[model samples]
Target: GRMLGEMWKAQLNQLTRQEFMEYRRDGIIEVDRSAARKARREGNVTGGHPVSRGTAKLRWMVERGFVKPHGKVIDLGCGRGGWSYYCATLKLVQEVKGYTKGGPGHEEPVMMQSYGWNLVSLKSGVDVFYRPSEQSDTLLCDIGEASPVPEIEEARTVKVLQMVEEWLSRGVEDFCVKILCPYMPKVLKELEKMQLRWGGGLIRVPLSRNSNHEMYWVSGASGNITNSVNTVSQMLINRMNRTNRNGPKYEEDVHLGSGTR
Candidate 1:
């Protein structure tokens, strides 16, 4: 369980300690860790599952071969700490930086208290990158004039990307790339968390043709690559993702049988 103090934020905003415990006792968020892992291993979604889809692209990047496990993971504009949490769990990312519209909350210090991680912090657009209940490893500067929290200065060692392709998959949705680009340098200026820098080029990912299939061709004429670290189900496709913990070949395993049959 990576830090979910924020996920529980909405809930914590409402409950007292006793009530929260009762909620846990009632299995509100009771996750069966072993069962889940067991189901993933069986090559059948680990349970009564049928076919699987993706987030595959992202998971792909996290493969031990691709990403540097036990390395730093930075999630720009990470809402609810979702992508960062995924990195921490799947990639065993040693350190994580989760930047949001604001910063971490006071009541939410579980990630630090529980894990011996000194490499977590929050950044704010307002320059109020405060750690509500604890001292942060880094205090994020303004998102516009952003720099690494002083504590995280220049010790880079990891890189990966998790994507939603584009916001709702359209340009009309982003009519103000110019406006956002002006005041959003701290975020926009930096390339991937640790992406290999080519001739100072920008990174991109595009959708595949037979999108009904989960796999999206990476690196095409667009010179863009989808989130190689994980595969994601198509936005229009059914919303169930298969388990990679099972193995890549299991998803669409087909064999040419002998003609004797």
Candidate 2:
């Protein structure tokens, strides 16, 4: 009775939940956890955990001064309350509003709820269920289509961009949003124009081939860096809008061929 391959993977049941969380908290951001360790003192479970992308995104926002310390926080598409929980940890914001349709990754919020974190709250419904207002400080819109709600077939990304505009209309200045690849160009252009009208603010980060495989745009570049961030962002915005109008690579080619005569 020999198996065709090794069914049991290495360290199958060695790591305790506590240990995994320890690694997650102390681990570096944007770095692969599986990478080999350098020190000999490292044990079998020295490094095999990475911080959550949501957490990293928040960290970036806080460092960039996009996230105000004392204001209401809104987490759109707040899967499992990752950002909400992280915001609570910061102890800066008075309220953390989280929203999701309740599917995958819903447990994290429930888990956090058990701890009775008064500042954090999670709501489940459609992707666009949460209605943000002018009083909100920041918004995290890392939405995905993995819910019971139906998705519009064509121009899906365009609809997401509309939501962005809606959030902006509500007077939420600071935002961390995930733009779908196909619509990223259009969305960036929209945000660029908004920056112009709203006065200096913009930061663009390329997350291609990474976990999100999308761009992270923060609108808090309102100081000395405004000129630089807006300038460079507009360049790419033009390039993406003009050249990479299609495909995942944001290429400059348009395909057209008749399927049948």
Candidate 3:
């Protein structure tokens, strides 16, 4: 099987002006601050997690070997493209593409360009979702706040699962989804089933001490990577235990107390 990075490179090499024009016509949109406010008001916004912690989580994944260096990453619901920017700056991923409901502002694209990544914005319409043109080594989906309405929450789960399945079929090596507890059970069951059907394992990591959300990482790699994942998990557990034993005092200390949750 071809690596996701190789496949993406081939697609990019074959990409022409006409294909670029079509992508711009179908996938790109100019959304401003007002659009963001409107999306928030309409409850269409998703994945508004803190950028700093998100960077830390990505770093952990890279260090643990869950995410390979120089691979391609696709970030779904990437707000402000901060995490994507961070990934690009690390030079770990050869390419980074982020999709968000509202624009990350004009300045954000400029910053991302410095790191050589693309931040693509889309409207708040359900029919305006952006799909990747090629496979990626890693897929990151962050569902920041789970909707209180059951129907909307379920719909989000279905949409996310559909993306996961599509990426898996395309041979994505590493997949991670960050979601709140309200809809965790359904996502968990479905992801576990998929992991079983494919090869690899699913592991869950909480984001913070009191955070309502947790991250689920699914790896299609063999047992060696799975063992590395477990080692990283245990290392985090030990760090968290040490922090709890000492008790946090300063505000900054409190933030570190959870050890990335």
Candidate 4:
């Protein structure tokens, strides 16, 4: 019965042909409804709703001037357009484009467009099936757990690294690129290589208590971005340390019958 109910709910969430066309006419959606339907039928769609690191992270970046306002931003590997919606709501960016690998099972973008946000959801993958035709002021890449594309660890790492390299070589002046992803040794190594090649334009900031995830910022024209990066890194580190200290007691702390205190 639960499964049946879930199916019913999914059906209810499906976008109607008329609704899809309206979204397309308004430039809120890039692909046709038929394309999404085909992706769903072929089981190529990603599961679960889109997720983000909340708005706090973006707020910090904006407040610190690491991310300038009123510029076009491209979200690569956007999961159901969550981050894109946030960017649009912030009104810091003039335009936002979200690129995903699969079709949506819901209408999250519809709500975003209703608010008159200049956000577009495209049913495609960056550096995979699609590529940006022109340069953007900001590029946000989140290839974390929420991505719809299937993970082949090594291949995915290479793909993401290659994409970064391509973007770097584009020679866009005053460009900014931010990437959020899970911890991967290869990624760090590749990032280091890129940093050496590009000179002091990239900084790696860890985002979890155990360093499970990392955030990277790159600016081709700004030399002061590193200062913001350092401040944020220290803030996260201190917060994690405090959390660990105040965390719940472990089972090992409990007294056992054997008196192994």
TM-score of each prediction: 0.27, 0.53, 0.52, 0.50
TM-score for candidate 2: 0.53
Model 4 / residue 94 / CA error / Å:
2.3
| Rank by TM-score (best first) | 2, 3, 4, 1
State the weakest 10-residue window (summed lDDT) of model 4: 252-261
lDDT tens readout by residue for model 4, 1-261: 222212322332353655323322231112123433454356532321113332334434544555553467776666556556556555556677767665455322222232224354544534432575456666666553322221334346556767756765765333334444322345445655766676435443322222222354545333443344344445443433342233221211100011100
Q: Show the lowest summed lDDT stretch of 10 residues, model 1.
A: 173-182
* Shift of residue 216 alpha carbon in model 3, Å: 1.8
Higher-TM-score candidate of 1 and 2: 2
lDDT of 4: 0.43
Question: lDDT of all the models against the reference?
Answer: 0.26, 0.46, 0.45, 0.43
Please identify model 3 stretches exceeding 4 Å from their true place.
1-52, 103-133, 148-155, 182-185, 204-206, 220-261
Residue-level lDDT tens digits of model 1 in 12-101:
335566543433223111222443335335533213211111122233433423233345544444443323433444334456666556
Which portions of model 2 miss their true places by more than 4 Å?
A: 1-51, 104-110, 113-116, 129-134, 144-154, 182-185, 199-213, 222-261
Q: Over the stretch 136-236, how does candidate 2's per-residue lDDT look in tens digits?
A: 77777776442111123113445665677777677775676654432233444565565566544444443232111234455654543334434433443
Selected candidate, larger lDDT, 2 vs 3: 2
Look at candidate 3 and tell me the lDDT of residue 93: 64
Each prediction's number of clashing residue pairs: 20, 0, 1, 0
